Design a protein around this ligand. Structure first.
Ligand SMILES: [Ca+2]
Ligand SMILES: [Ca+2]
Ligand SMILES: [Ca+2]
Ligand SMILES: [Ca+2]
Ligand SMILES: [Ca+2]
Ligand SMILES: [Ca+2]
Length: 210
């Protein structure tokens, strides 16, 4: 019986291999599995420059491990080729890789620093500022809610829109400036992430002696 080449048996050679982006470097991703009808000893590998940058393959076993972090936010799908040889010949076969998203970004505020000057006689109800953050994670992990931390008795903030309003009469003679902490938190159900930003509110002294 003349030589037959080995063949792979993993299902993912027909469909795709989904790997979560939170897979730690150094962790195994899968094991390549193959059969050689001559019962030859096998050597497993990875074929291609980019593929070899992200994946290492144990030659004696076909265990695939991660060499560099995956990042769904940079590249979420790509192709690799894996190899198996019986020391006589070698086959290479493509696999579609999809990188699975996790919530691994907190929100980023834009156009900082935040500051605004308002008169001490600004009427309650007046909108005075709009904060802005974004978050690149998918789904609920990319949805941002705003709040003041702790809640302010002088200013409200719309948790969806980021619009800040005056909610109590101001008084320069008591407070000449506020330094408010804005919290932006994403809405991931399992592991929400937060970012803080300052909003400085400078109060203009008005000639308001009673
Ligand atoms: Ca063989
Ligand atoms: Ca990421
Ligand atoms: Ca992510
Ligand atoms: Ca997020
Ligand atoms: Ca006053
Ligand atoms: Ca005054």
């Amino acid at each position: 019986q003349v030589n037959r080449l080995p063949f792979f048996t993993n299902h993912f050679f027909d469909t795709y291999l989904l790997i979560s982006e939170d897979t730690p470097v150094g962790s195994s991703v899968t094991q390549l599995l193959a059969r050689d009808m001559d019962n030859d000893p096998l050597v497993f590998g990875v074929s291609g420059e980019e593929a070899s940058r992200f994946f290492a393959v144990e030659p004696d076993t076909g265990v695939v491990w991660l060499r560099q972090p995956l990042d769904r936010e940079t590249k979420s799908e790509f192709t690799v080729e894996f190899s198996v040889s019986d020391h006589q010949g070698v086959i290479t076969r493509k696999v579609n890789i999809q990188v699975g998203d996790v919530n691994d970004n907190a929100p980023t505020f834009h156009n900082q620093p935040y500051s605004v000057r308002i008169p001490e006689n600004t009427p309650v109800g007046t909108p005075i500022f709009i904060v802005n953050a974004t978050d690149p994670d998918l789904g609920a992990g990319g949805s941002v809610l705003y709040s003041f931390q702790p809640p302010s008795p002088f200013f409200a903030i719309d948790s969806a829109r980021g619009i800040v309003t005056v909610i109590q009469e101001l008084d320069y003679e008591v407070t000449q400036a506020y330094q408010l902490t804005v919290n932006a938190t994403d809405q991931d159900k399992t592991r929400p992430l937060s970012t803080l930003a300052n909003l400085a509110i400078i109060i203009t002294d008005m000639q308001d002696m009673d």
